[model samples]
Every structure is written in C-alpha cells, then in structure tokens.
Target: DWGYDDKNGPEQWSKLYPIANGNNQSPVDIKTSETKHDTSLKPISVSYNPATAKEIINVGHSFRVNFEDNDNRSVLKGGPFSDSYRLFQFHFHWGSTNEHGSEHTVDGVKYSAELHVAHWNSAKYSSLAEAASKADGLAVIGVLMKVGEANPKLQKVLDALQAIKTKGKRAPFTNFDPSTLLPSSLDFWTYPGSLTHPPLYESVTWIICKESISVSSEQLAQFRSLLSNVEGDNAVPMQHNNRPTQPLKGRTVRASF
Candidate 1:
C-alpha cells in the first residue's frame, strides 16, 4: 500500500498502515555527505551456492526467486551482522523504463532498479515467519541496477519470465548463483529499516552496496512485461511497485568500507 499514489484513494500510506509514518521506515534517500563512515563496520559478504535457487514467481508486485534456507549453505555474514543469516529468497524492483525504480537513492539520484537479497537470522530464529517482526532477525542486501551493456547473468533470469507472466505463477528456476548478480565491491551502507512493500515489517537491517550491477535495456522491458493480475483477469502490467524512498528522520546510516 506504500506505493499506491492513488488517484481516488487515501493520501499517505499512513492511512492504511499507521506504521507507514513510523520513524524507521525503509528506502530512505542516502545523502553521501551526511552518511557516517563507521570504521567499526565489518566487511559484509555472502556465500551462495548455484543450486540454492528453488523457483521463480510473480508475486503481484515483482518476480521473486525463492531459495532453500533449511540450513546455512547459503549465508550472509559479517558487516553489521553478528551470527550468520540464511538466504531465504531474492527479488527485483524495477521501473517501466530506466528513469526511476529503485527504492533507496544516493544524493537523491534514483537508479533504474534494485535487487533485494532476503536473509533471515536462522541461527536465532526458526524461519522468516518468526523472525520477520524481531528487531535483528532480517538482513536484506540491496543491490542497485544501472543501464548499460547486455548483462548475460541477468538474461538467465529474464529468459524465465515467460513461464510466470501472471501473479502467483511460479516455475522451476534451478542452479543459479545469486552472487553472480553482485558487483565486484562489497562495500555497503547500513541502516535500520522496514520492508518496502505491504505488511511493512520494520525488521530489515539494510545493507545497500556501493557498487551496482548492470542490466540491458531489453532486459528492462522483460521486467515490465510481468502481469499483476491472475491468468483470467485483464492484465495490469507489473511495470512499477517500488516504495518511494522514505525520510531518514534521525536514523544514522553507517558505511562499511
């Protein structure tokens, strides 16, 4: 509901979910000059296996690739985290074109898209369901996307879009390494935040990378082709669902460099 700039509906999302107006809401604009460089911040890293990805589905808002997180084979460690966090699922948030789509911004500049790698603190909690509301349970890695030459790694995901055009349609997407989608640098910015979409839980410890991966123009079109509706209904093109960047308020953003 946070993304709904409704023509005939409520004003701010605070109307629906009162917490939308909360202090620690996510996707805040990162002012480079203001962000603090915390030397104590560790090097954020992930080790994912190619066979971790289970299935890819159109979750109305975006296409999500769910992973098997029963163990610690694919885990995110160090940086702003203490114990290891298990990879749960991964998804993309993109725009209709390349103008604006990313949730968080740098110096008020929006990227073409953003990738969210969801990881749960399995060391302490049972699953995402139980950890989603806990303060230090969820750690989402945010990777921004820039428009450039053809990204062969991204094409692998786009090729499967045809199989899951409509919402809730999931298909087998196997043996893909999510880490291949990341940039060379692991430097990042950390902050306390919430989920960008509905049921906005304030559980995410946002670790947004400084470097971004590239995506081709054609691939961006493939993302826009996803449908928000079911198989029988008139399709609402899943072009945009990114929650607009929230105010940073008094929250401190720590950099890992």
Candidate 2:
C-alpha cells in the first residue's frame, strides 16, 4: 500500500502512480513574496447545506467527512473558477507534533495541520472519479490550522473520532455546516495543483486561505489519538500524514486579497 513509510512513501509512488511526477504536483512551498496579486480574481463564494453532510470515516490515511452531493445545494463558486463546483468530502493531514505538519507551506513556514474541502466541477464532469482524470475538474479549498483556542466546531469532529478509532470504521455525522470550520477571511492564494496522494492527479484548482483555524493542544492531542491500523493491531499512530511540498515547476500562484 502507498503510504508515508520508507517502503511505500512519496518518493517511491511514481513507480506505481505515474501522475505523481506530474508538472503541477500539489502541496507546493508557497513563497508569498513570489505570488502575484490579481485584482481580477473574484471573491470566492461558498454555499453549503449542513444537512448535506452524511458521515465520517477513518480511511487509514486520514479521517474524512463525506457529503451527499447529489444536488447543487452545497457548492463553491467565483474565485478563479468559471462554474460552480459541488462539495464532496473534507479531510485533514497532521503530524506527530504541532510545529510542522501542513502539506502546503507559506514562505517556507509549515503549519500545525491542514484541511482539504474537496469538490468536483459539476458543470463539466459527471462524477468525481471522471473529474479526477481531467485537468480542470476539481477544486479543493485548503485551510491551515494553528495551535490556539479550542474550536467548538472542531470539537464535534473530535468527539466522534473515538467511534471510528480504527481503519475502515465509520460513524454517522450530519447537520453540520463545514463552512463553520473555515477561518474569518476568505482571502486566498490560488493555483493549479494535484492531489497529494496516490494517483496524484493534477486536476485541482487550489484555493488556500490566508487565515488559519485554531485548534488547542488538547484538541490536537485528540487528533493524534487516531490510529492508522485496525483494532487489535499494534496501534500505529496516524501522524505525519502530510506529504512534503513538491517543486512548483514554474506554475504561477495568484493571490485574491
């Protein structure tokens, strides 16, 4: 299985998933000094229905909250996009410690954690899998997490983690508006990038927020309590789930502020 281990890490993934070597690989080191400010970039618009959220799952790599996207009730618009993208799922990546775990860095600085709210271009693609293979089929909003006050919204997610303490486990999660998890500012850096995992498809239009959400030390500890392995297995703490920032390869990063 492809993972963040020596035998099956990011460096070795290209052998199996050729797209890992794509030019627009994601989780890049965002040098704010180099990012171009675009006045033409439209403000991002997010419309989410709390009831659309269905369940949460322990997918080994990370804990994800899946949504019911059968309709356009939950979607993202504006920004650098020409059409609305339907919300699909959201997940997180963290480290063994809080100092540095984010996949995408800002001016060589890494955050404590990262959150990805993934979406598909419903205006073009019929399904997420189909969109995953196309160049302009997905949009993922990335939010950095800092160590500070305990977020009540995040607490709801952590409180459910115990029910999904092992890989493949899932629990009911609903009536939650993911927008509540977002930071105050919608200002962000926009760029073209790829998925950070296996089959690293370079189809994402990344909108990374400038502001970060706060997660207390106690809350962060709850995240660390998760296991990558299944129950009865030697508990392997799921940490350092973030992939290192890939080379930018000359891609231009635009800031919408």
Candidate 3:
C-alpha cells in the first residue's frame, strides 16, 4: 500500500476518476508539427485579480483549492496577465513517473507534475470568473515538475493536506501567490484550447513551459503519505493522480521555442 514512484504515480490516474478520463483524457503529449511560422505573435496583458483566499478547501484525493478571502489580495503572475483575468481555482496533475505524467507535454515528452493557473477573459472582468465559461474565458499556465532537490515552499501545502483529507473539507491558507511556486525562468510555450475538465469548452489559452521545477524527495514523500484511511479506509494511495493522454482533436499547440 506504499505506492509513490515513477511507476505508480499520476501517469496512471485514469482509473481513479473514470468519468473524467472516459472520453477526453488529460496530460496529452504535444508533438512538433511542420506548419508555417507566424513570427508576429504578440503577448496578452493581464491584471492580477486580488484574491482573498483565507481558507484552503479540501477536495479529497490529495487535492485542494484555496479560496481567497475578501481582505487578502493575491495575484497570478506571468505574461498576458491583465485586469480582465481573474484568478480562478488552481489544481495539480501528477504522475508516477518523474519523467512523464504532466498535463501539457512538449514534443511528445511528459514531465512529472503539471500545475494549471486558470484565469478569466477580459471581456467579462466585471462579472464572475466562471461566467466566461470554457470558451474565450480561460488562460491556463502549465508548469511542469521534475525530480531533484527539495522545495521548502511546498512544505506548507503538504502539511495542509494532512489536516483536511476529505471531499468538501476546508482549511485556512492565505497570502499565497501562484508565482511563488514557479521556477525563476518565465520562458514558456503558448497555445489555444479548452479546459481539460468537463464541458470541455474550447476557450483556453494554454501557456506550457519547456523547463521543469525540481522538487525534493521529502516533498514527494509528503504527497504520497496521503491516506483516505477514514470512511472505510477508502485508503487508496495517491499515486499516478494524473489523467491519461487525450486526442489532439484538431487542436493547435504552440511552443516558445
């Protein structure tokens, strides 16, 4: 019952969330194409929406989303960050293999963990971030995770998950920036697509990176140390918590290279 390695991680998470993986799987690899070049690509501007996430809500299965509090103002970093973009809920997709298992792949290569930074479109800045829906309503920044030394910043997150390990359970986690978790370099790949989640609306502007951030073995240990030990020990080890690969579906994936 101690599964947490390259062979038993998120790369194989399709079975756990069957419905999500039934049709449009996630973590799909992006292959290089022979299309013509378009050198005039311009970056979008984004305004960091103030987040008051005072609490971290437990969404079970070693996953959680922090709800911004009304007082604390947090921001989402990276280019194309504009006033129209409001920081929506962020989540993770990991794999058993340190080499493969991320949501956004590069030239057919998969990373370890993929962090998605979701945002709302500018047209509906006055409205809720969710109102934009999947189409023309989202911008996701894909950050890859790799093997290496430990990351001290992740200690708080690993510790928080221990306290609340169930569906609908919530905790307090404030004053955090999605940028803090990212590596130093901002060089990345950008594209247009839809949310990998339900409704699968094709309204997502995906910015996936080529480089990956290294995390310590201890940090990984904390992630694997999860337990659904309560309620019938629904105690499935949180290994391969990644959705399987999905089809290209006539989608266009671009890289920073």
Candidate 4:
C-alpha cells in the first residue's frame, strides 16, 4: 500500500509504518566535513560467485537481481562487521531524468542513480527475512551511478529488461559477476541506517563507496522503459524511486580510506 506518490509516499508512511520516522532512518545526506575518519575500520571484503545470480525481476518499486544465498559462496565481511553477511539481492534507484535520483547524497549533490547490494547477517541469522527486523541484521553496499561511457558489464543486465518490462515479470540471469560493476577504489563511508523503502527497518550497516560506475544515456534510458504497473492499468513508470534525505540524528559516520 506504500509507494512514491503524493498521497501514499514516504511522507505518509509513518501512518502505517511507525519506523518511517525513526531516528536512525536511512538515505541521509552524507557531509564529508562531518564524517570521522576511522583507522580501525577494515576494508570491505566480498566473495561473490557469478553463478549465484539466479534471475532478474521487476518488483514495481525497482528491478532487482535475485541471488541464490543458501551458502557462503557469495558473502561480505569487514567494514564494521564482526561476521560475514551473505549476499541475497541487488537493485537500483533512479530518477525520471538524469540530474537527480540517488537516495543518499554527498554534500547535497545527487547522482544519476544509486545501486544497493543487499546482504544479511548470515553468521547470526538463518535468513535475510529473519534478519530484516533486528539491529545489525542487514549490510548493504551503496554504489553511486554516473553518466559516461556504456559499461559492457551492465549490458547483460540491460538486455534482459525488455523481457521484464512490466511489474511481476522476471527472466533468467545467469553467470554474472556483479563485482565487475564495482569501482576500482573500495574507499567507503560507513553508517547505521534503515531501509529506504517501507518497513524502513533500522537494521542496516551502510557501506557506501566513494567512487562510482558509469553508464551511457542509452543504457540508462532502458531502465526507464520498464513500467511499475502491469499492462492495461495506468502505466506508472518506475522512475524517481528515491527517498528524500533524512536527518542524521547525531549518528557518527565513519570513513574507511
């Protein structure tokens, strides 16, 4: 029942989901000057098996690539975490146009898009769904997206978009190494925050990369073509699917450089 509209969007979410207005809610404005550089923070370590990528689907809010997370083949560790978090799925948030769409911004500057690589505390919980409600349950890597040359690494995913042009549709997405899409620099800013969407659980340890990946205009537009609604209904394009910046609420943001 929640969406990115005037009547039922984030503004009214607190009416149904109380945590929407919680102090530790996510997608905050990251101010470089205010962040603390922590030498103790470890570099994030990730091990992702290309074959773990099962399929890609359009779930109305965003198009996500689901993974087979039963084992430890695809897992993330380090960067403020005491145990390995298993990768489950990855998705993106984008705007209708090129100027602004990122859920988390840097000094008031919004990027063209944002990528969320979601993982759960596999070491402490049995499943991602089970971990979604507890503190320190989820660890998501946020990568910013910019406009530039078309990335060949993203082409395979983009090519599958047409098959899932409408909500509730999905297609096979195999043998894909998502790590290929990461930036060369692993430097990141870490924080405690909540999910940007409804349920808005304050259970995420956010590791947002300083560098970003590039995608051409043509390729970026392919994402916009997908509709949030199914055919015959009012076609609601899945654009500007980003939450506004939330108050930091005095949380300490640590940077690992």
Candidate 5:
C-alpha cells in the first residue's frame, strides 16, 4: 500500500528496517556477457482462444486478460515439466521509455514490454503465495516486444482497454483468447527466479523467449491511453507503474538459443 516517496518509500525503508536496507535490496542489474547459451529448453506452452475466453476487467494499473474457467483449468492441468501447475493470473510490464520496459533484461537489451503468464504448482500442496518459496513451483512465460510497424495482433486487447480505463471501473470481457498474441516460436530461456513485485516472492521458473513480437506505436498508445490518476485523487498522471528490477540473489539466467 506504499508508494516510492512515502515514509515507506523505497529510500526510507531502511530507516523502517534498520537491518535490511532497501538500497541493498532491489533492482538488480544484469550485465550482458559473451557466454554461450543453452539451446534446448522450449518456452512454456500456453493456449488462448479469444473465442473461448471471458473477460473480467478491474481498475488496476492495467487492463488484463482473464481466461475462461475451463481454459484456466485446462492449462493448469497439463505440464511441460513434471510438477502440476495452475494458472493463477496474468499481468504486464511497460516502460516510461520505449527503449526499456521489461522487468527482466537479456544481454543488457531492454525490450519494449514484457508479458508474464504466471502459474503455480498444484502438486506441491502449497498455496500459490506459499509456492513462492520453491524454484519448481512456478512457471512464467516472458514475451518481449520491439517497436515496430503497428501490431495488428495486439489491437483487440488494446481496444478493450477503453472500457475499464478508470480506477474501480470494470467491464465484462469475452471471446478473447490470450494465446493469439504470443509469438509463434516456442524457443525460450529457463532459470530459477521469483515474482517481480512485492512480497517479491523468491520461487519462480523464469522462461524468457528470444523472439519479440512487434507492437505499433498506436497500439502501444492504445495501452498507454488507459492510465488513471494516481491512487490518490490529486489528479496526477498515472505514468509508468512498474516495480524496479529485483535481486538475482546469486541465480543463473540461462538462454536457449
């Protein structure tokens, strides 16, 4: 519930917690290297048929695609890996600058945006929140975006943003399958990591794909146009609302090229 500048602002957190200074804590920088990449692991598989999806929009920072109960159950019922996982939620990351927006960095190049399709292991007997403690408990799909000629693929979702553009306003969404927006290539980089935001949970299986789909300035503008005023009603613009990069905490990021 705290913004960056409050007494709880990231800068002041250390004062609140004398032992764990927030400065020592966040926004990990991943330096690019000339190392070889692991080329075997495929990106996690997800199927979305807009025809089958039901939309549930809420006034959060962004407009999200909510899958039908059946689709959600089906995706969660299968596995690319052994542990069973369930789809929990899907959200996005955008930037103030087009040059950089993704929460995860690859070879030091930031993409136009990143999309996370989050799932939690159902076999481990841990709550989705609790599974944040184990490496194998979570599987995330990372989609990268590059500034390109306008993207026709994203127009549907972007068009829906107009309905739920304001805070606390939500609308019924249907006939949308999020899978259509994904890149055709399944090639991906897999590694262990955590949720990118608060509680900043530590249990994640990161799968970042090599291909970035094209998004148009207009489509991106369609997305940007949906912002609301700040959480407070001072009429402040809701610019970029994203968590800074997080600690790698001595983890390896593998690329499957």
Candidate 6:
C-alpha cells in the first residue's frame, strides 16, 4: 500500500502509477504574478442539501465526509464550469506541523491545512466513477486554512472525528452544510490538474479560493489525532498527508476575481 513515508510517498508514486508524472499533475504552486484575470469566469454557485450528507470516514490518507451525489440536489455551477458537477466528498490535507501543510501555495508560501470538496460532472457522466475517465470530468474547490482563531463552522465536523479515529472507522454524520466550510469571498485561481494522490488521474479542474479560512492551534492538534492505521494495528498518526506541489508544465492558470 502507498503511504506517506519516505519510501511509499509521492516520489515513489510514479514507479507504481505512470500518470503520477503526467503533463497535468495537481497541487501546482500558484504564482500570483503569472496568473491572468479571466473575465469570462462567473461567480461560483452552490446549492447544497445538508440532509444528503451521510458519513465521515478515515480512508487512510485523511478523513472524508461523504455525500449522496445521485441527483442535482447538491451541485456546483458557475465559475470555470459550464455544466453542473455533483458533490461527492470533502477531505483535508495537512503536515505533521503547522508550519507547512497546504497542497497549493502562493509564491512558495504554505498554510496550516487545506480542504478539498470534490465533485464529478453529472451533466456528461453517469456516475462519479465514470466521470474520472475524462479530462474535464471532475471539479474540486480548494480552500486553504491558516492558523488563527477557532472556526466554529468546522467544529461539528471535527467533533465527529473522535468516533472515526482509526483508518477504517466511520461515524454517521448528517445535516451538515458543506457551504459553511467555504470562505465568504469566492475569488479563486482556476486551472486544469489531476488527482493529488495515487492513480493520479489527470481529470480535475481545480478552483482554489484566494481567501483562507482560520483554525486555531488547538483545533489543528485535533486533526493530528487521527490514525492512519486501523485498530489492532500500530498507532500511526495521519500527519503530513499532503503531497508536495508538482511541476506546472506551461499550463495557464487563470484568476477569477
């Protein structure tokens, strides 16, 4: 199994999955000086049904709050997408320490953590799994988190994490509005990229918010409490779960103001 250790981390992913080194790899360093403003981009629109959210589980990489995407009850419209993308799941990425954790960076500066809400194109594909095969199949909203005050919007989600301490453990989590996780301003950077982890499918259209949310130091400690291994297995903290930024092979990154 691919883990975030020195041996099994991202550097070795290319040896297992050839696409890890593909042309459109994700988590690119966003150089603000180079990104051009895209006038054609529209403001992001989201209509979510909190009742559709099901469970929060630890999938080894990080914890995720899974949602039902069978219909248009919860979807992403506007922004860089012309078609509606169904909300699939949301997860986070962080380092062992608060110094550097975010997947995407601005001029080589990293934040405390990052939240990725993944959605699949339901307009063209039958299912989220089916959508991953195409280049424009997926859309993800990347919200960077910096350490400051405790975020009450995220406390409910974090509280559920206690029951899901182990890698495979899951707890029922419903009626959670994911939109609350987003920053007030929708200004973001847009680009075409791939999955940040294994299989490294180059099918994502990443929309990273310019504004960062806040999480206190104590709250970040709660995130580090998560275990990568299952119960009865060796206790291993799920820290540094973020893959380092990859080379941006001449891809044009657009800024949506």
Query: Highest TM-score: which candidate?
Result: 6
Off by over 4 Å in 4: none
Q: Please identify model 2 stretches exceeding 4 Å from their true place.
A: none
Pairs of residues clashing in candidate 2: none
Give the alpha-carbon lDDT of every model.
Answer: 0.85, 0.90, 0.57, 0.89, 0.59, 0.91
Error of 5 at 193 (Å): 1.3
Q: Would you list the clashing residue pairs of candidate 6?
A: none
lDDT per residue as tens, model 2, 1-257: 89988789888999999878789999898888899989789999999999999999998878999999898999999999898999999988887798987899998888899999999999998888899878899899999998888778887798899999889999899998899889888999999999999889888999999998988878878878888899899999877688988989899999896
Candidate 5 per-residue lDDT over residues 111-223, each given as its tens digit: 77777776777677457656655657777777888887887866666767767666666666666556666678866665556555545445667666667888766655655
TM, every model: 0.95, 0.97, 0.74, 0.97, 0.77, 0.98
Rank by lDDT, descending?
6, 2, 4, 1, 5, 3
Off by over 4 Å in 3: 1-26, 32-51, 69-83, 97-99, 125-132, 228-234
Residue 34 lDDT in candidate 1: 85
Model 3 over residues 1-257: C-alpha lDDT tens digits?
21234453334333453434333334456676732234444443333432444566644444655544222143343454343455656667665556654767666676767777666654544444454454456767778887688877676677787666654557777656566666666656665565565444556667666567877656666665555345355665555455555775555555444
The positional error of residue 139 in candidate 4, measured at the CA in angstroms, is: 0.5
| Model 4 C-alpha lDDT per residue in residues 1-257, reported as the tens digit of each score | 89888898888999999988889999999999999989888888888999899999988878999999999999999888889999999888888788887889999998888889999998889988899988989999999998778878888888899899898999899998788888889999999999999989999999999998887777778888889898689988776688898998889888896
Q: Which stretches of candidate 5 lie over 4 Å from their true place?
A: 3-43, 48-52, 68-72, 76-80, 126-135, 230-236
Q: How much is 232 displaced in model 4, in angstroms? A: 3.5
lDDT of 1 by residue, 32-101 (tens): 8888888778787789987888999888767899998888889999997888999988898887679998
